[PDB]
Amino acid sequence: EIRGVAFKELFRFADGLDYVLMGIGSVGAFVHGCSLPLFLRFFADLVNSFGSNSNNVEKMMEEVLKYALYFLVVGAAIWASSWAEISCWMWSGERQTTKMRIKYLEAALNQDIQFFDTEVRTSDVVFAINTDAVMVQDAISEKLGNFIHYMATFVSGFIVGFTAVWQLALVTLAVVPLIAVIGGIHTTTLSKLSNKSQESLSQAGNIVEQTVVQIRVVMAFVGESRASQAYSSALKIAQKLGYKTGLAKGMGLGATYFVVFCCYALLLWYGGYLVRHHLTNGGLAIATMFAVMIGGLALGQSAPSMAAFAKAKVAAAKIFRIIDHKPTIERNSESGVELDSVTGLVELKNVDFSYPSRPDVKILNNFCLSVPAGKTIALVGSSGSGKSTVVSLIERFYDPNSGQVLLDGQDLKTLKLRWLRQQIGLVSQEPALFATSIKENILLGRPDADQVEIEEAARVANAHSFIIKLPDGFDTQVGERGLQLSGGQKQRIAIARAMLKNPAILLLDEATSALDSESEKLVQEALDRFMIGRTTLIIAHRLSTIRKADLVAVLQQGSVSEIGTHDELFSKGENGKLAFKDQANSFWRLAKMNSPEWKYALLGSVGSVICGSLSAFFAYVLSAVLSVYYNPDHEYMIKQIDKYCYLLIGLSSAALVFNTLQHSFWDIVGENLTKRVREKMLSAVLKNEMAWFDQEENESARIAARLALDANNVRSAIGDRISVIVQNTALMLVACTAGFVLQWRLALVLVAVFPVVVAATVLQKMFMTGFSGDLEAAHAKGTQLAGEAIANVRTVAAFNSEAKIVRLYTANLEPPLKRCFWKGQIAGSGYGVAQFCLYASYALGLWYASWLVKHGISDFSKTIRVFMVLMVSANGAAETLTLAPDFIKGGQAMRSVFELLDRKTEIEPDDPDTTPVPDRLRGEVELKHIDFSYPSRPDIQIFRDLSLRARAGKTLALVGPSGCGKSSVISLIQRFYEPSSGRVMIDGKDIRKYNLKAIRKHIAIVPQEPCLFGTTIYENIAYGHECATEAEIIQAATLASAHKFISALPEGYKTYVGERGVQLSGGQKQRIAIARALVRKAEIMLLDEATSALDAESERSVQEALDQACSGRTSIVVAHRLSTIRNAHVIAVIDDGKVAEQGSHSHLLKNHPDGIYARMIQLQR
């Protein structure tokens, strides 16, 4: 396969406007990248002129004013360059990708069906839209501009550093690889540990998934405690892994800080050494160190652009592979012929289109069909693939295999696709309603129709019926809340679309089987009763569709063995603003929940504070050193520099230790809180109603994802941001007090421009993250429309709707293009304004410091210290501000957690106070006056005053009709559900006022669906009893005859079983389930359908096991088997929920057995 395409080939769809936009964006990116080292050079010059002219205040003032004006110029240039790069790059990328998406969809729809059958799957073609949006759109829009900007930053920083002071720049260049290596090691270790932790969390989520999808048996066998214990053990494993991750992260940050501080101490000492020997000044030294570091960071940030370039190269190679392919059918004569005035007597004398995915096997053998002109024909046979193949051959899907197919004596090779498709009124299995308005779907047959023609076409489907009462009539769309059901109007919509097309030769297909007779009867009256009936083949439900048809044309082995009259029968055997007060209260409650860990957090908090202070100290030291750089006394400079270097090394050691401490303790408390919350949520979920589990929102996958997502958000957001906000608040406080006590005038002035600085820095962080949001979410409508069109390429090609589909695609993609353009313009303008205001604030601060020094109010050293410390504090505040959205997300996640946890249950399985349980039960049960609503579908009500009797020690074999009630009765006696007015009357007492756990301790359940747990069958049998020994398991296996096959298995009781397991036979796993029921050893055992699909030996063995199990004491069995139910005291058949005669199998009186218990016995024998 192709491993990529040339990078320049990614710009295939770029026009002159795209080229000029890319040029402007490149220039803007280059200037914006080069600006920052230029600002560093200007800052160095300003500091040199401000510190070297203490004797002459005048010249100092003019130089400071000049360099403040230079700062303003740099800010304006940054504004212009950032605006240009962001807007131009974003818009050009969007334009190119939209053009390529349109071309890709057009090419895909222009391909043949065999292309999707053999070369590329349809799912891959649909996924290509999203993979394009993710890689190709993103690399050429933002990643390329970022790459240019970071290359410019790196080159300009290196040039500035090596032109200012080449020796110190060389030393910093040697330093940079140390930080790079430390960061790389930290990232690799953290990624590996996080991968392991994610695997452990996935195992825990799998445990939740398996215990929620199969709650029927978990609740019945009071296994919630075992599930909670297993989940707790998995969470302990994940918690140890999380502790290791936190320790590794703390160690990495500590090592980074230690290396940075030690290397900066060395660099400051060497810069001092240069200053004494008059090779430079302090400002140049600081500037060159910072510039070389900025260049290294620029390379580091530019690497991801290269990664995105590689990904987009691969994706664009795939996209161009799909686009550049040429269709095979289109290679014929584009002129063709149009015979016109079709009669409809086409003759398919031999078949073709052998599904080239499987050319060795020929699915359809050559046969003659010869549909008569103006006469209906219907053919049934094979397994539905033959009829579909005949339809495909009729719709010019020809691939030369055998003979030819002709229309009215004209072979289709001379015919044209654009005309032949117009003559075919296809109706398929799926109506294939595209995401658009109803009037567009109906008009899709031919765009040259009007409203009146659409009205007449829909008139056949009972005028409008459901359509007229729709919110917007024909203009409503199917994407939003419309009908959203297969048994809806969409089939009639497809029928109307066919009617709006030419009523020539047409290919009917089997319609829906749900809803009522109106839809199908409309199908015949619009497709068979309009005269000139065509080939209306029926794949399934041939009870009356083919009986009404005049021809049968049976299709054994892909050939017409018999054709003609329809009277003769055959061997058919088919079935037939958000609130914040409550949010803060919720944080208070959550912090109360994890109270035992406060000390941990508290200790970590202390470390956090210290860490913040350390940062401030570093800043101070730098400024202090800068001041010492501008001191005529050389020896005093030596002493001060040595003192500051030693203090910096001490700060490095302290930073390592306390960063490790802070991160480790905060992650420890976060993981403990997360585990406690997860356990609480699982305990709350398992203690709920079965009707609660029946809801779609509480589906197994949904609950698993909710548990895996909400807890992770509550962990990460809360822990990370609480640590960050504590350390940054400490940094802010110490910085503010230091700046004030040094020079409160300058400190106050800088605090005035504090919001401007924090806004500019948060915009800088957003720019580094990316100014384009979710790209796939922008084109969601277009993507889903394209996916629907491609998945139904047969329908699109049948109606010649490729042009209409691509036009709708362009119409859907234009608003995202305009929105992207405006978003890019707004983002560029805002970012540029923020940067300009930031540099204006810097210039104003320096000018005010110079003015204060000029008037004798302060000195150079105090002012420079205040400035640097305050700027560092502002940067920390900006970091907190940009981490705040994670706080918002964690708050909403924890709100969801608490709303789930505080949910109250109408039934509680563990009632603290109730009448005591008897050790031995009598077993009698009454179901007097049962009225069960079944709240899953309240529109359907069952058990019309149902009444059930079962006294001690006899098997109750009520069966009823299949598909009505059945297992629901069992669901009542476990009290999974609650009858509206029913009375459960077991053992002369009421369950609804009784403890559920005590009863479930005494009842056995074997549902018709097999139940499998874990990986070993041993615990599958053992699940019945909490403390079942080996002897009990052996005995229960012998009673159920389960020992023989499980001994035949190699691993035996420890055989790998489950969804990924051996996937053994249904009978064996049913034996396992009944063995588990015997292990429970319940005084009351309840059975279910036991004869779904088994062979003779397995059927006999499981029946013997059932007879052995029911013997001994009271049991209820339903099943569906004919007779030989052994214990046949009374057998009841439900009639739409009402109570009917409980005719026994002895046939005492022939009223009930002759009524319902007669036909099914003869049919099943």
From Swiss-Prot:
<keyword id="KW-1070">Brassinosteroid signaling pathway</keyword>
<feature type="binding site">
    <location>
        <position position="355"/>
    </location>
    <ligand>
        <name>ATP 1</name>
    </ligand>
</feature>
<feature type="glycosylation site" description="N-linked (GlcNAc...) asparagine">
    <location>
        <position position="698"/>
    </location>
</feature>
<dbReference type="GO" id="GO:0005886">
    <property type="term" value="C:plasma membrane"/>
</dbReference>
<protein>
    <recommendedName>
        <fullName>ABC transporter B family member 1</fullName>
    </recommendedName>
</protein>
<feature type="binding site">
    <location>
        <position position="117"/>
    </location>
    <ligand>
        <name>ATP 1</name>
    </ligand>
</feature>
<dbReference type="Pfam" id="PF00664">
    <property type="entry name" value="ABC_membrane"/>
</dbReference>
<keyword id="KW-0325">Glycoprotein</keyword>
<dbReference type="InterPro" id="IPR017871">
    <property type="entry name" value="ABC_transporter-like_CS"/>
</dbReference>
<dbReference type="Pfam" id="PF00005">
    <property type="entry name" value="ABC_tran"/>
</dbReference>
<dbReference type="GO" id="GO:0048443">
    <property type="term" value="P:stamen development"/>
</dbReference>
<feature type="transmembrane region" description="Helical">
    <location>
        <begin position="20"/>
        <end position="40"/>
    </location>
</feature>
<dbReference type="GO" id="GO:0016887">
    <property type="term" value="F:ATP hydrolysis activity"/>
</dbReference>
<feature type="domain" description="ABC transmembrane type-1 2">
    <location>
        <begin position="601"/>
        <end position="889"/>
    </location>
</feature>
<dbReference type="GO" id="GO:0009733">
    <property type="term" value="P:response to auxin"/>
</dbReference>
<feature type="transmembrane region" description="Helical">
    <location>
        <begin position="722"/>
        <end position="744"/>
    </location>
</feature>
<dbReference type="InterPro" id="IPR003593">
    <property type="entry name" value="AAA+_ATPase"/>
</dbReference>
<feature type="glycosylation site" description="N-linked (GlcNAc...) asparagine">
    <location>
        <position position="195"/>
    </location>
</feature>
<feature type="binding site">
    <location>
        <position position="966"/>
    </location>
    <ligand>
        <name>ATP 2</name>
    </ligand>
</feature>
<feature type="binding site">
    <location>
        <position position="879"/>
    </location>
    <ligand>
        <name>brassinolide</name>
    </ligand>
</feature>
<dbReference type="GO" id="GO:0009624">
    <property type="term" value="P:response to nematode"/>
</dbReference>
<feature type="binding site">
    <location>
        <position position="264"/>
    </location>
    <ligand>
        <name>brassinolide</name>
    </ligand>
</feature>
<keyword id="KW-0927">Auxin signaling pathway</keyword>
<feature type="binding site">
    <location>
        <position position="386"/>
    </location>
    <ligand>
        <name>ATP 1</name>
    </ligand>
</feature>
<feature type="transmembrane region" description="Helical">
    <location>
        <begin position="746"/>
        <end position="768"/>
    </location>
</feature>
<keyword id="KW-0812">Transmembrane</keyword>
<dbReference type="GO" id="GO:0005783">
    <property type="term" value="C:endoplasmic reticulum"/>
</dbReference>
<comment type="subunit">
    <text>Interacts with 1-naphthylphthalamic acid (NPA) and FKBP42/TWD1.</text>
</comment>
<comment type="function">
    <text>Brassinosteroid exporter that, in conjunction with ABCB19, supports the accumulation of exogenous brassinosteroids (BR) in the apoplast, thus promoting BR signaling initiation involving the specific receptor BRI1 and required for plant growth and stress responses. Auxin efflux transporter that acts as a negative regulator of light signaling to promote hypocotyl elongation. May contribute to the regulation of leaf position and morphology during PHOT1-mediated blue light responses involving auxin distribution, especially in low light fluence.</text>
</comment>
<feature type="binding site">
    <location>
        <position position="937"/>
    </location>
    <ligand>
        <name>ATP 2</name>
    </ligand>
</feature>
<dbReference type="GO" id="GO:0009741">
    <property type="term" value="P:response to brassinosteroid"/>
</dbReference>
<feature type="binding site">
    <location>
        <position position="694"/>
    </location>
    <ligand>
        <name>ATP 2</name>
    </ligand>
</feature>
<feature type="binding site">
    <location>
        <position position="387"/>
    </location>
    <ligand>
        <name>ATP 1</name>
    </ligand>
</feature>
<dbReference type="GO" id="GO:0009926">
    <property type="term" value="P:auxin polar transport"/>
</dbReference>
<feature type="binding site">
    <location>
        <position position="967"/>
    </location>
    <ligand>
        <name>ATP 2</name>
    </ligand>
</feature>
<dbReference type="GO" id="GO:0009637">
    <property type="term" value="P:response to blue light"/>
</dbReference>
<dbReference type="GO" id="GO:0009734">
    <property type="term" value="P:auxin-activated signaling pathway"/>
</dbReference>
<keyword id="KW-0472">Membrane</keyword>
<feature type="transmembrane region" description="Helical">
    <location>
        <begin position="71"/>
        <end position="91"/>
    </location>
</feature>
<comment type="similarity">
    <text>Belongs to the ABC transporter superfamily. ABCB family. Multidrug resistance exporter (TC 3.A.1.201) subfamily.</text>
</comment>
<dbReference type="GO" id="GO:0009640">
    <property type="term" value="P:photomorphogenesis"/>
</dbReference>
<dbReference type="InterPro" id="IPR036640">
    <property type="entry name" value="ABC1_TM_sf"/>
</dbReference>
